[model samples]
Target: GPSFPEPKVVRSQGGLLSLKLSATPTPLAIAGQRATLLTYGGSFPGPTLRVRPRDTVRLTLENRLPEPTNLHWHGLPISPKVDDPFLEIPPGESWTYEFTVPKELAGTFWYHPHLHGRVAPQLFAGLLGALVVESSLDAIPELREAEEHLLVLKDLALQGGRPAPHTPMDWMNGKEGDLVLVNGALRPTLVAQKATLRLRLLNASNARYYRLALQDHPLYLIAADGGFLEEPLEVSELLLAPGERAEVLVRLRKEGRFLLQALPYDRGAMGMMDMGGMAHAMPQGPSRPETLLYLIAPKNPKPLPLPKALSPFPTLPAPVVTRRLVLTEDMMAARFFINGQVFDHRRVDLKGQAQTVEVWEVENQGDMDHPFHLHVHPFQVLSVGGRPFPYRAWKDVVNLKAGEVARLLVPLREKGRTVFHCHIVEHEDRGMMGVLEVG
Candidate 1:
């Protein structure tokens, strides 16, 4: 795949970044037969874009593909009117995005095409990329690194024993396979510098939530969907849903081998049902589990120790406002929704002001679990089923367990309206999304 051009940093002046959306066909051998796979930049899982917060950004998107296209700055605090707009760039046309970075947010974000009706196909064709926003603080102890790595997790559908590039039907069924990639490489092996390594993980799949774990190593999670947590949350596994990103700090205890594994959540597939209440059965028997990435510890590596805390995480006071959204599935269409409403790209649902805290009660009325994601700002999971979230970890995206109610404290610290939606791509495209505004 073509590497995304490094973003030119401009101090006060704006920087221009040009992106061309085109399809390139590559030959792949499938079941002893060679087939051409249509890919983005001639590869699966595009490239990475690194930028700093407070920098003015101008992204010129050239739609060189045969279809209409638009870009959504997922997880970033850009203007929702422009970030998730209904504007379309006709084939062979372009759109210029001009915006100033808000001062409030600094963390890992991402971008992808948000064109309606075709989002699934476009994204599956490898149109996604990482958008990293660096913090103003230069001495972030956890981020002191000579190198930064990006991990994008995705499950692709296979046909004829090879990756089937695009299939609209697969989108409807929330198609997923066993293949996983990290930073565009399959089962990638990374050489750790024998120092503290910062890993930014993005779950960019269409409809799969991953339970990630470092084999035999307890991961120290420093940040979630939003920014840094008040304190580190030590855990064996971290759940990342589609569209969610987590920033983690891993210190090399010694030079060794480590495996990153994504445990399969097969129960999620059993909940799919047709209009007649008949469940769509999965392939018979047990499913296959796989590894995501490998880490080769560097010998005599730089000694990096874990910190007690990196940033000051403010506690969320009681909310002055609250809203409840129920997530449900349409039996007939097999479509997931929030409060029975599907997403209408041009519609705005809720509007509010900056600095306001809203308590959101997310009730999952569907048989399947859904990971709820909010753009622009991170929220604190106050409670689940009325019990306080144990760690108080700040998260921008969280899983709404089946038939469970999750209470989230949303802080509208960033300006402009942003999207709140299910991370499952098919669900979002089919109306499992809403809008929240902060002015």
Candidate 2:
């Protein structure tokens, strides 16, 4: 079995971390075949930047590609200026970002191109990386002793040693690649030690929803997109939509081969699109279950004890305001919308006061599912489709099915201008996004 392809890990030293990210056309082996794709620092899924809370990071991004691009620290509650998608770096230009990691942020995060129109093509061509904010929980004996693996899950559609060019349908449907990749390798194998395994999973795909499950093992979900849960929730299957992440602990009882798979899940279909009164049938991806990773556990494994308590769960107070956002798509114009309007960077679609609680009622009125993502502040899912969320956890991305509504308890802790939108980058790039002004 081919070993897993691990990304380079860069950790901060002495509360400071500095690095350079050059986004350029780089050649790499994809599933054993040579391919050229745009990469950060010439690595598929670039280097994993690990830093502790309160650490300051100074990194320079050099845009070497042919197009304008910028970086967005996805799911990170950082300053809006550092995570600005409007700060486009043109070809051959460079920009340095300096930010101190807030003490509140921990768990898994990611970085990728976020310049409105070019976000789809740049990300589709492979420019993304994982980010981890270390927490005190890392020192827990049960979790600290376990072997951790960072899985950057993304898919790519290859053609003649390069990524396939995007089509109109790609924009409409939010392109899902045919070849599923776990850490930039196809069907990679992880030979595990005889201890507890911490699998940090990040769904870096454009539009794929990974309903992850181990063949015969329970996935103890310990953390969500924003941070750790109070207690690990034992789940049989976990669905991670685009831009969402989860940390699951798996204890292999016996020495055998285990398959990590993405079970079949119909996100939704586009059905028929009447363009100028002519019926045009929309397309969808495959419906069968797909294998993502192979875990080969050692014989006679010793299971590590699972932690009884992980983190503190806080209860949000009563909301001072309630906002309703409608997600709809206009097939005639091949655009998506939030509240009936496209994204205008200069416009503030909504307003909120800092240090206040709000309940956001996000309704997916379109024909398909959309994962809604907020920029700086993470929220707690209060209810979905009128039913309460099974567990209380902080989340930055929540997938809403067609005609479904989700209620979120959002704490506006940060003040500034930011955006929230569908995590489907194509849909987001088109218009399924809105700006907010928090004072």
Candidate 3:
């Protein structure tokens, strides 16, 4: 395994970040082999764009591939006018995306292609990057002094030095890659001194779910998708589905090797047994444990203390309205649906008044799990599976298993057209998505 390759960091200079990226095929080393895969700026997982709150990003994306594609900012509180998914860049053409980062948003966000039915294929081919917002959390001595790492997790299955084509079963169950990549390398190693280490993790995979854990170590969670948590939460295992993000701190007291592993967890898949002998095609069991990275702390360390409080707990207003959303699949037709209808760009599936709080009851009626994601607006999980969440945290993505229902408290403050969809890009392309209009 190679050492972890850190992506190039592009920071905002004088309150603005400007860059030009070309999406095309590039030769790169993968799992000890050379492969030509689609990439942005000739690198897999692209460059990391870092900016402060209230900074502006002026980006130009040139589409060199022979297909249509577009960029979507996942989990950022920006206007749909800027993060628009319907804005496509045709083959050989280019587009500019300009938007100011909101003053309140500060977390680990990402960018990827969201061109209607081509999301899964484009993303699987390698077209994504991380976008991070520097916030007050960075001012804390305990956090700011620690060694920080930006981790992007992705998986891919290669055939003959290239990504394998999707299968029929891949359409029914979202595609999960065979090789798990950390910063675009397989089982890479990270060298660190014995000290406090901060890991900002983003799940950029199309369909895989990672039950992350470090052997013989406890992870202290400090931030969620939207931003910082009020206080640190110690956990033995943290599960991150597609499109989710988290910030955790690890205090390296000993000098040795620590294995970052994805533990086994059974997130059910569509069996399709009722459709005859097609049951074996889709996975009907749990995912196996896999190593993501290795942290080698082998020298004298400058240990840092943990902060007491990170941020004030948020207070959400009482809901004035309620909306019920359902997820289902027509396995025979190989199509997925939200609220019994496929995605239609010409239609608005739901409407809301600006600056109002609403209760959204999202239910997963399908046999598999779907991680629900909403653009622009962040939500607080009130309850999942009838069990109320014990702590408060902001989330733009929520994972729901089959037969489970999640209640969310959402504040519709931004006005424009956005989308809510299952984070599984394949399911989203097949139609598990809906449009939201807030005025």
Instruction: Give the per-residue lDDT digits (tens) of candidate 3, residues 1-439.
Output: 3345878899999999999999998888878988888889888889999999889899999999989999998888888999898888999999999999888777899999999999999999899999999997698788777878898999998888878788877877788888999999989899985488889999999899999999878999988988888888899999999999999999887888889999887777656554564544355798888999998874776577789888886787889999999999886577999999999999999999999999999999987889999998999988999999755778999999999999999999789998999999899999999999999
Order by TM-score, highest first: 2, 3, 1
User: For model 2, how does the per-residue alpha-carbon lDDT over 264-325 read when each residue is reduced to its tens digit?
Assistant: 88886455566796877474544578899899987788887899899987867789999999
Show where candidate 2 strays beyond 4 Å. 1-3, 269-277, 282-286
Candidates arranged by lDDT, highest first: 2, 3, 1
CA-only RMSD, every prediction: 4.4, 1.8, 2.0
Q: CA shift at 23, candidate 3, in angstroms?
A: 1.0
Alpha carbon lDDT of residue 252, candidate 1? 70
The candidate 3 region of ten consecutive residues with least summed lDDT is: 272-281
Model 1 over residues 1-439: C-alpha lDDT tens digits? 3232122222233453444435444565422345454454444555465566666666777676778888888766556666754678898787777676666566677778777667776676567766777775426554565346778787665665445654444544455655666654567677775367777788888766678888767777877776777677778888787778887777676777888888766425553335585656333222355688787777777755666666686766667888889998764465667777788766778887788788889998876667888877678888886788866545767787678899988888768766787766667777788877688
lDDT value for candidate 3? 0.89
Q: After superposition, how far is residue 310 of candidate 1 from its true place, in Å?
A: 1.2
TM-score of the candidate numbered 1?
0.84
Off by over 4 Å in 1: 1-43, 158-173, 271-287, 315-318, 345-348, 353-355, 390-394, 413-418, 437-439
